[PDB]
Every structure is written in C-alpha cells, then in structure tokens.
Amino acid sequence: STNPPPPETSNPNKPKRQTNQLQYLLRVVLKTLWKHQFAWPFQQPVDAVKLNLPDYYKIIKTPMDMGTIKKRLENNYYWNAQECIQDFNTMFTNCYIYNKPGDDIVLMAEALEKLFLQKINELPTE
Amino acid sequence: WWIIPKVKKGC
C-alpha cells in the first residue's frame, strides 16, 4: 500500500574505481537513453502510490530505474560494468513482467531496450 | 503524463 524505499545508490564501504566501460555506460548509454522521448516513466522509481498500482511491489521484488542507475554510476557504486548492465536489464524485465504487451509502457520499454542494446554492442574494450 | 497509468500515455 506504500512505496518501498528506493534502491541504495551510495555506499562508502564498497571499493570505488573508474573504468572506461563505466564512463561509457554513464556518458553514452545512460545519457542517450535519458534523452529519449520514451524515457520519462523510467527516470525514477515506480511510484505505485501515485500511479494507483497497489500490486506493483507485490509482483516486482527487484525494482530498478534509470535515476537509480545514474546515481549509482555517479557514486561509483558499480565495480564491474556487468553490474550496471544487469540493472538496466532488470529495469526492462520488470516492466515486461508487470505490464501487458499492448500497454504504452511496454512499447516504450521495447524502444528503449533496442537503443540500449545498440549502445551496449559498442561498449569499448577494457 | 498518463491517461491510464502504464496503459495509455497522454503525451
């Protein structure tokens, strides 16, 4: 009936590094997706209270959104690029699981996922 | 913005 707290985005006990793949994920992948016409429902955690989705978090136990991913990248929360990629994949899969295939949100997620894959296919070598 | 949340957007 309430929203859960949003995912953690900062942790001073985790080691921190910057890598060229993590920089690409932030400056190319995240930035490109954020600017997309269909990004707005994905820029913050799903507000199941405001959107009147009382079962959202009864079904989705691993919420993820691009606002969280951005702040995780900015806080050097991720050590491996694959951690970040997994969060993007979780965000898309949540949307496909909760919603129905003809819903506008799913059409939006599919277009963003296509763009995501196009950018991930160009991920630079480490 | 949503006409029906998730189902139909209005923008």
Author numbering:
A (entry chain A): 42 to 167
B (entry chain C): 1 to 11
Q: What did the article's authors report about this structure?
A:
Among BD1 domains, peptides 3.1B and 3.1C displayed little selectivity, with affinities of each peptide for BRD2-BD1 and BRD4-BD1 within a factor of 2 to 4 of their affinity for BRD3-BD1, the domain against which they were selected. All of the residues in all three structures that contact 3.1C are completely conserved, consistent with the very similar affinities observed by SPR. In the structures with BD1 domains, this AcK lies within a channel formed between conserved Phe (in the loop following αZ) and Asp (αD) residues. The peptides that did not display a preference for the BET BDs, such as 3.1C, 3.2B, and 4.2A, tended to belong to families with members in all three selections.
